[PDB]
Amino acid sequence: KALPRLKQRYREEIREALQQEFNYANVMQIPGVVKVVVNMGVGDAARDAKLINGAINDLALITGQKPEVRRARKSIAQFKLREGMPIGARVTLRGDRMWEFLDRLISIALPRIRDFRGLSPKQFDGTGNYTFGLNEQSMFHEIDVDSIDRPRGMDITVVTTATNDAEGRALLRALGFPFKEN
Amino acid sequence: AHKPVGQNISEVRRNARLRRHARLRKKVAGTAEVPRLVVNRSARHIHVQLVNDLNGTTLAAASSIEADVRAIDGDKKAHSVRVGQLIAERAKAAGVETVVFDRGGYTYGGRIAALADAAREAGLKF
Amino acid sequence: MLIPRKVKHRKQHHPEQRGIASGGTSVSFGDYGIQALEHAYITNRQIESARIAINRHIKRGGKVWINIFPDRPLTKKPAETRMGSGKGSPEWWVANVKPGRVLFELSYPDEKTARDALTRAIHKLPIKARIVTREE
Amino acid sequence: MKPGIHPDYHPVVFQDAATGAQFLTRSTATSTRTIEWPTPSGPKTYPLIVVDVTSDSHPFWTGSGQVEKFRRRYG
Amino acid sequence: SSSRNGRDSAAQRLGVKRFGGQVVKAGEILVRQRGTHFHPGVNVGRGGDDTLFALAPGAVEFGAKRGRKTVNIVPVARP
Amino acid sequence: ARNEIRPIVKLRSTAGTGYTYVTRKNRRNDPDRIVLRKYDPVLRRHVEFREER
RNA sequence: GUGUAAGUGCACAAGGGAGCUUGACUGCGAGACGGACAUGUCGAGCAGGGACGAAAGUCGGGACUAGUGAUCCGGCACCUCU
RNA sequence: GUUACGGCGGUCCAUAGCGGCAGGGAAACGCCCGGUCCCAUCCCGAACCCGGAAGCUAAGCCUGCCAGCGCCGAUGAUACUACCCAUCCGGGUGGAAAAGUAGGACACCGCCGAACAC
């Protein structure tokens, strides 16, 4: 007994508009976002093993779920990197929590970037999966932006059952990502 | 001229099931006095067999499709329970008391486990 | 000079001199070829001498292919040493050459000069050989 | 989701402090990260969060040398 | 002025020991081997060193089961 | 081999009310020595030993 | 990739990961390999008493082969032997 | 018995695979709706698990088509070889490859269950 904003919108308008654009036979062919992905590469694992915990705490406060700590399966010593050194955190988002996260991101933070002209239409890949990146976490009001001791940027990537970049960009437009309309 | 990209989870789930079922099958055996109790599940209904892997033959059978088993009202679990009853009766008619239990590539618990536990209760030795 | 840049095993048995060719019994890339008849080990220096013999007999333009490469070493061991006490070090590199096999292929227009050149390169080698046209 | 608890999850009302085009919806943002004023926008009552800036208050795609001047300025 | 080579390792007597057709008792050793060059089939068991042995008497049949050479044992006919 | 203070060190594993020393060779740069352990003694049954050197 | 050299094998995984955990047990052992001799190698199956598992069943160290030294003479604990 | 059905298996396991084309959804195989209850994520009801049948055969799957990517594959000859003859060379009786070729092949078989029927 509840509905998020973007999901109600998705089931109302966007499916209709893509149908009226691309004319699929079955509606099962309709594109739909599955999951959302978050990652943070600490990179100074061999110099600060504590920024890892810092990033864990930030993403906790940001996404409302305890992250995963991705280990280094290979040992490349030109970076000090050794088998099992924690280099980064990672979180998966699916469902109502995902739609809420996109609502927050599109409505609070991305309208808080400094001189946001536009996210490119060219972060796609093969079929329409949008892989962008943030330099700082100085933007989410979710975050306690008084306590941060360093910039700890991140990298986001958005995956969809779309089959090509045209359908991907069209769907993400209907959903309200500020592309550079070109 | 629309065209897809790759694997659907139906294919994934199917071939993973076959993968782990024919993993498990290494240890399970078949014989006409100790046959294998295979189970084959779907979301809606369920099927089971007693198998002799010496000849790849079959001695009993049951499923939740038969109207006499649909005459249950209760949960999926209760359908499964009555199925275990029927297969106990049929197996012990055709002349099998002891068997093994192949979970067929599925996890134990829920409908599978309630079936098997009903059968253990109603006489089969496993 | 012809040598490989590296071999895995730098001390090998002596190649065999038994049997006829399986490949290289057919001129490939030129017009006028050389074909062996005997069994022999042909080294680096011989082939250098021969290609120079050919290039100093055509002297301008016309191409020369060498379908052989010395990829099998042999081991001399230092002088006046009693037998035993190991296996000597590689010093020169041979290619085995079974009868029927083709060594050289020329591409120069006139058969006169070409046949003569190949003959001058035959007289720089240990084997009886003959000259080939690509035809049947 | 699972024990080994995550942050807490409660609704939120993001009150548009730009032009009054507010938002309100379920979230994982709560005791964790919420503001006072439990204002019911709906049949129930749940926390509120002043929204210093947003979309309809952030000019962007979704929101809104010269010689002819030199000798305009230089007369 | 030394040959630093010269070592070697004594044998282990590996290979097949009861070929096709023969009569074998129980617990008898068909093959000694390092890896599972030959795998077990029916009425055959594996060891620690990937040796094989018989679990039931009978006679041999080196057949394949999905691309892998197996070893089996079949019932002798009782006299 | 010898009796040097090797990394793989120590021995003796004695039993409570069970006098059947079971032996094992283990390291000693790790911490522990007051938990785990089990085995079958004489006249008795599956019960708990110490690593007592 | 497999702890460590190489080979034979491993995707049906013996590779990677998580939960319990001590069978890295006791008393034996049919029949066999290899075999100068002493050494050496596997071993189904039985019994007590256990682990894991829902059960079937597997567990008498490590994916296998190397990682150590006969006999004599002494040393420590236990024995209802003298 | 039978159809474009499902499931368990087998072949000394690609003659069975990959890719392209068309085509099917009665009961079933499915995908899908949602996390109330068992149960679960090294975070995520994504997976496993649970409760149902709004929707679609788009995909999985099954059916036919394409010998194209791969595979299979002879006869005869040759290489090699056992034995014998033979003063070097070479040869005779028997055995017989690899490659290549002709070709084959878009698998075959068994059991139970359904649906269908006398």
PDB file of all heavy atoms in Angstrom, chain A residues 152-172:
ATOM      1  N   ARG A 152      36.052  11.886  -0.963  1.00  0.00           N
ATOM      2  CA  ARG A 152      35.971  10.475  -1.313  1.00  0.00           C
ATOM      3  C   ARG A 152      34.887  10.386  -2.376  1.00  0.00           C
ATOM      4  O   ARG A 152      33.702  10.239  -2.068  1.00  0.00           O
ATOM      5  CB  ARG A 152      35.666   9.614  -0.094  1.00  0.00           C
ATOM      6  CG  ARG A 152      36.812   9.521   0.872  1.00  0.00           C
ATOM      7  CD  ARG A 152      36.535   8.513   1.982  1.00  0.00           C
ATOM      8  NE  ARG A 152      35.535   9.000   2.929  1.00  0.00           N
ATOM      9  CZ  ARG A 152      35.803   9.735   4.010  1.00  0.00           C
ATOM     10  NH1 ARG A 152      37.046  10.106   4.310  1.00  0.00           N
ATOM     11  NH2 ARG A 152      34.811  10.119   4.802  1.00  0.00           N
ATOM     12  N   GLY A 153      35.302  10.501  -3.626  1.00  0.00           N
ATOM     13  CA  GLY A 153      34.375  10.475  -4.726  1.00  0.00           C
ATOM     14  C   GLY A 153      33.828   9.089  -4.934  1.00  0.00           C
ATOM     15  O   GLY A 153      34.102   8.151  -4.187  1.00  0.00           O
ATOM     16  N   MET A 154      33.040   8.952  -5.990  1.00  0.00           N
ATOM     17  CA  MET A 154      32.398   7.682  -6.269  1.00  0.00           C
ATOM     18  C   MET A 154      32.126   7.579  -7.758  1.00  0.00           C
ATOM     19  O   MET A 154      32.380   8.508  -8.530  1.00  0.00           O
ATOM     20  CB  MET A 154      31.105   7.528  -5.475  1.00  0.00           C
ATOM     21  CG  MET A 154      29.971   8.433  -5.916  1.00  0.00           C
ATOM     22  SD  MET A 154      28.511   8.192  -4.903  1.00  0.00           S
ATOM     23  CE  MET A 154      29.074   8.938  -3.397  1.00  0.00           C
ATOM     24  N   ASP A 155      31.542   6.449  -8.137  1.00  0.00           N
ATOM     25  CA  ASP A 155      31.226   6.157  -9.522  1.00  0.00           C
ATOM     26  C   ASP A 155      29.925   5.384  -9.552  1.00  0.00           C
ATOM     27  O   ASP A 155      29.792   4.354  -8.878  1.00  0.00           O
ATOM     28  CB  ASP A 155      32.353   5.372 -10.181  1.00  0.00           C
ATOM     29  CG  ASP A 155      33.579   6.212 -10.416  1.00  0.00           C
ATOM     30  OD1 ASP A 155      33.415   7.402 -10.742  1.00  0.00           O
ATOM     31  OD2 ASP A 155      34.702   5.695 -10.243  1.00  0.00           O
ATOM     32  N   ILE A 156      28.973   5.899 -10.319  1.00  0.00           N
ATOM     33  CA  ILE A 156      27.630   5.362 -10.410  1.00  0.00           C
ATOM     34  C   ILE A 156      27.444   4.823 -11.812  1.00  0.00           C
ATOM     35  O   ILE A 156      28.011   5.339 -12.781  1.00  0.00           O
ATOM     36  CB  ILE A 156      26.564   6.430 -10.119  1.00  0.00           C
ATOM     37  CG1 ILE A 156      26.859   7.195  -8.830  1.00  0.00           C
ATOM     38  CG2 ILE A 156      25.226   5.803 -10.039  1.00  0.00           C
ATOM     39  CD1 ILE A 156      26.894   6.377  -7.576  1.00  0.00           C
ATOM     40  N   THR A 157      26.612   3.797 -11.924  1.00  0.00           N
ATOM     41  CA  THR A 157      26.297   3.240 -13.229  1.00  0.00           C
ATOM     42  C   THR A 157      24.923   2.602 -13.174  1.00  0.00           C
ATOM     43  O   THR A 157      24.585   1.902 -12.218  1.00  0.00           O
ATOM     44  CB  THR A 157      27.360   2.251 -13.702  1.00  0.00           C
ATOM     45  OG1 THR A 157      27.050   1.820 -15.029  1.00  0.00           O
ATOM     46  CG2 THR A 157      27.450   1.066 -12.824  1.00  0.00           C
ATOM     47  N   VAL A 158      24.151   2.868 -14.210  1.00  0.00           N
ATOM     48  CA  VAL A 158      22.723   2.622 -14.246  1.00  0.00           C
ATOM     49  C   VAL A 158      22.448   1.685 -15.405  1.00  0.00           C
ATOM     50  O   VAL A 158      22.735   2.019 -16.557  1.00  0.00           O
ATOM     51  CB  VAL A 158      21.958   3.938 -14.405  1.00  0.00           C
ATOM     52  CG1 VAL A 158      20.516   3.682 -14.647  1.00  0.00           C
ATOM     53  CG2 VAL A 158      22.160   4.774 -13.183  1.00  0.00           C
ATOM     54  N   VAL A 159      21.875   0.531 -15.105  1.00  0.00           N
ATOM     55  CA  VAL A 159      21.704  -0.544 -16.068  1.00  0.00           C
ATOM     56  C   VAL A 159      20.223  -0.797 -16.298  1.00  0.00           C
ATOM     57  O   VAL A 159      19.409  -0.714 -15.373  1.00  0.00           O
ATOM     58  CB  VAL A 159      22.443  -1.812 -15.611  1.00  0.00           C
ATOM     59  CG1 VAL A 159      22.102  -2.139 -14.208  1.00  0.00           C
ATOM     60  CG2 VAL A 159      22.110  -2.980 -16.522  1.00  0.00           C
ATOM     61  N   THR A 160      19.892  -1.126 -17.539  1.00  0.00           N
ATOM     62  CA  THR A 160      18.536  -1.116 -18.046  1.00  0.00           C
ATOM     63  C   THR A 160      18.421  -2.229 -19.068  1.00  0.00           C
ATOM     64  O   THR A 160      19.399  -2.546 -19.746  1.00  0.00           O
ATOM     65  CB  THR A 160      18.231   0.232 -18.703  1.00  0.00           C
ATOM     66  OG1 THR A 160      18.484   1.295 -17.777  1.00  0.00           O
ATOM     67  CG2 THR A 160      16.796   0.313 -19.166  1.00  0.00           C
ATOM     68  N   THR A 161      17.222  -2.791 -19.211  1.00  0.00           N
ATOM     69  CA  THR A 161      16.974  -3.815 -20.217  1.00  0.00           C
ATOM     70  C   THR A 161      16.834  -3.248 -21.620  1.00  0.00           C
ATOM     71  O   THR A 161      16.432  -3.977 -22.533  1.00  0.00           O
ATOM     72  CB  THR A 161      15.715  -4.602 -19.872  1.00  0.00           C
ATOM     73  OG1 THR A 161      14.613  -3.701 -19.763  1.00  0.00           O
ATOM     74  CG2 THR A 161      15.894  -5.338 -18.595  1.00  0.00           C
ATOM     75  N   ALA A 162      17.133  -1.969 -21.812  1.00  0.00           N
ATOM     76  CA  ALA A 162      17.152  -1.389 -23.137  1.00  0.00           C
ATOM     77  C   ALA A 162      18.161  -2.112 -24.012  1.00  0.00           C
ATOM     78  O   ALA A 162      19.195  -2.592 -23.539  1.00  0.00           O
ATOM     79  CB  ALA A 162      17.494   0.091 -23.038  1.00  0.00           C
ATOM     80  N   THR A 163      17.843  -2.194 -25.301  1.00  0.00           N
ATOM     81  CA  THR A 163      18.672  -2.898 -26.267  1.00  0.00           C
ATOM     82  C   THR A 163      19.608  -1.996 -27.056  1.00  0.00           C
ATOM     83  O   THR A 163      20.525  -2.513 -27.701  1.00  0.00           O
ATOM     84  CB  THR A 163      17.788  -3.673 -27.244  1.00  0.00           C
ATOM     85  OG1 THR A 163      16.854  -2.776 -27.854  1.00  0.00           O
ATOM     86  CG2 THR A 163      17.031  -4.759 -26.516  1.00  0.00           C
ATOM     87  N   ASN A 164      19.411  -0.680 -27.041  1.00  0.00           N
ATOM     88  CA  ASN A 164      20.323   0.210 -27.744  1.00  0.00           C
ATOM     89  C   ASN A 164      20.300   1.589 -27.104  1.00  0.00           C
ATOM     90  O   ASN A 164      19.402   1.934 -26.329  1.00  0.00           O
ATOM     91  CB  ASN A 164      19.997   0.280 -29.241  1.00  0.00           C
ATOM     92  CG  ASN A 164      18.588   0.698 -29.511  1.00  0.00           C
ATOM     93  OD1 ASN A 164      17.840   1.050 -28.600  1.00  0.00           O
ATOM     94  ND2 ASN A 164      18.205   0.655 -30.777  1.00  0.00           N
ATOM     95  N   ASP A 165      21.309   2.380 -27.469  1.00  0.00           N
ATOM     96  CA  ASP A 165      21.538   3.675 -26.845  1.00  0.00           C
ATOM     97  C   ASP A 165      20.385   4.632 -27.096  1.00  0.00           C
ATOM     98  O   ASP A 165      20.092   5.487 -26.259  1.00  0.00           O
ATOM     99  CB  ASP A 165      22.835   4.270 -27.375  1.00  0.00           C
ATOM    100  CG  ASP A 165      24.049   3.461 -26.982  1.00  0.00           C
ATOM    101  OD1 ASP A 165      24.003   2.808 -25.924  1.00  0.00           O
ATOM    102  OD2 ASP A 165      25.051   3.473 -27.729  1.00  0.00           O
ATOM    103  N   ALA A 166      19.724   4.514 -28.244  1.00  0.00           N
ATOM    104  CA  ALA A 166      18.604   5.403 -28.528  1.00  0.00           C
ATOM    105  C   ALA A 166      17.470   5.160 -27.544  1.00  0.00           C
ATOM    106  O   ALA A 166      16.926   6.101 -26.952  1.00  0.00           O
ATOM    107  CB  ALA A 166      18.128   5.208 -29.967  1.00  0.00           C
ATOM    108  N   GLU A 167      17.129   3.896 -27.327  1.00  0.00           N
ATOM    109  CA  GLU A 167      16.079   3.587 -26.373  1.00  0.00           C
ATOM    110  C   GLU A 167      16.514   3.935 -24.961  1.00  0.00           C
ATOM    111  O   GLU A 167      15.702   4.411 -24.161  1.00  0.00           O
ATOM    112  CB  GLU A 167      15.702   2.113 -26.487  1.00  0.00           C
ATOM    113  CG  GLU A 167      15.010   1.781 -27.808  1.00  0.00           C
ATOM    114  CD  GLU A 167      14.663   0.319 -27.941  1.00  0.00           C
ATOM    115  OE1 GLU A 167      15.021  -0.463 -27.038  1.00  0.00           O
ATOM    116  OE2 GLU A 167      14.032  -0.048 -28.954  1.00  0.00           O
ATOM    117  N   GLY A 168      17.797   3.759 -24.661  1.00  0.00           N
ATOM    118  CA  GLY A 168      18.284   4.103 -23.340  1.00  0.00           C
ATOM    119  C   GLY A 168      18.171   5.584 -23.054  1.00  0.00           C
ATOM    120  O   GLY A 168      17.640   5.988 -22.015  1.00  0.00           O
ATOM    121  N   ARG A 169      18.672   6.415 -23.969  1.00  0.00           N
ATOM    122  CA  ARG A 169      18.601   7.855 -23.770  1.00  0.00           C
ATOM    123  C   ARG A 169      17.158   8.321 -23.717  1.00  0.00           C
ATOM    124  O   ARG A 169      16.811   9.174 -22.898  1.00  0.00           O
ATOM    125  CB  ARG A 169      19.374   8.595 -24.864  1.00  0.00           C
ATOM    126  CG  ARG A 169      18.719   8.693 -26.234  1.00  0.00           C
ATOM    127  CD  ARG A 169      19.621   9.408 -27.215  1.00  0.00           C
ATOM    128  NE  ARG A 169      20.716   8.565 -27.689  1.00  0.00           N
ATOM    129  CZ  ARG A 169      21.954   8.536 -27.197  1.00  0.00           C
ATOM    130  NH1 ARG A 169      22.304   9.261 -26.146  1.00  0.00           N
ATOM    131  NH2 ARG A 169      22.851   7.729 -27.739  1.00  0.00           N
ATOM    132  N   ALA A 170      16.292   7.758 -24.563  1.00  0.00           N
ATOM    133  CA  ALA A 170      14.894   8.162 -24.548  1.00  0.00           C
ATOM    134  C   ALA A 170      14.237   7.830 -23.216  1.00  0.00           C
ATOM    135  O   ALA A 170      13.515   8.656 -22.642  1.00  0.00           O
ATOM    136  CB  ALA A 170      14.149   7.487 -25.691  1.00  0.00           C
ATOM    137  N   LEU A 171      14.484   6.625 -22.706  1.00  0.00           N
ATOM    138  CA  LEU A 171      13.915   6.234 -21.424  1.00  0.00           C
ATOM    139  C   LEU A 171      14.420   7.115 -20.295  1.00  0.00           C
ATOM    140  O   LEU A 171      13.641   7.571 -19.449  1.00  0.00           O
ATOM    141  CB  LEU A 171      14.248   4.776 -21.146  1.00  0.00           C
ATOM    142  CG  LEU A 171      13.936   4.251 -19.753  1.00  0.00           C
ATOM    143  CD1 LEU A 171      12.536   4.556 -19.383  1.00  0.00           C
ATOM    144  CD2 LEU A 171      14.153   2.764 -19.747  1.00  0.00           C
ATOM    145  N   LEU A 172      15.721   7.359 -20.258  1.00  0.00           N
ATOM    146  CA  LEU A 172      16.271   8.149 -19.174  1.00  0.00           C
ATOM    147  C   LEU A 172      15.833   9.600 -19.273  1.00  0.00           C
ATOM    148  O   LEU A 172      15.704  10.279 -18.250  1.00  0.00           O
ATOM    149  CB  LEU A 172      17.783   8.019 -19.184  1.00  0.00           C
ATOM    150  CG  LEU A 172      18.290   6.598 -18.939  1.00  0.00           C
ATOM    151  CD1 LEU A 172      19.789   6.496 -19.143  1.00  0.00           C
ATOM    152  CD2 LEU A 172      17.920   6.135 -17.562  1.00  0.00           C
TER     153      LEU A 172
END
